[model samples]
Target: SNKGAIIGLMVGGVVIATVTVITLVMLKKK
Candidate 1:
């Protein structure tokens, strides 16, 4: 229910944040 949805949103946020940080790091290297 609400708890499950909240957890899912948090997981999505974490995944997006991680990908964003990695992309920035790669761009800096190049």
Candidate 2:
């Protein structure tokens, strides 16, 4: 259960980070 929780958090963080980076790039382009 602990391991699964850690993996879930990591995946969530990665997704959030990816979205943030994409948003920043789009803003810069504009």
Candidate 3:
């Protein structure tokens, strides 16, 4: 269960970071 939790956290963090970067780029383009 610990391994699964770690993987979940990593994926969640990556997703959040990707979305944040995309949003920042869009704002800069506007």
Candidate 4:
């Protein structure tokens, strides 16, 4: 169960980071 939890955390981190970067880039245009 720890292995699955670690993988889920990593996937969530990647998704959050991607969204943050996209938001910053989009805001920079204004």
Local accuracy of candidate 3 as per-residue lDDT tens digits, 1-30: 476878778988999989999999998997
Off by over 4 Å in 4: 1-3
The C-alpha stretches of model 3 lying farther than 4 A from their native spots are 1-4
**lDDT of each structure?**
0.88, 0.88, 0.87, 0.88
Minimum summed lDDT over a 10-residue window in model 2 is located at 1-10
Provide TM-scores for the models: 0.61, 0.59, 0.60, 0.61
Candidate 2: clashing residue pairs, number = 0
Clash pairs, model 2 backbone: none
Per-residue lDDT tens digits of candidate 1, residues 1-30? 476878778988999989999999998997
Question: Per-residue CA lDDT of candidate 2, range 1-30, in tens?
Answer: 476878778988999999999999998997
After superposing candidate 1, which stretches have Cα over 4 Å from the reference?
1-3
RMSD in order of candidates: 1.8, 1.9, 1.9, 1.7
Higher-ranked by TM-score: 3 or 4: 4
Look at candidate 3 and give me any clashing residue pairs: none
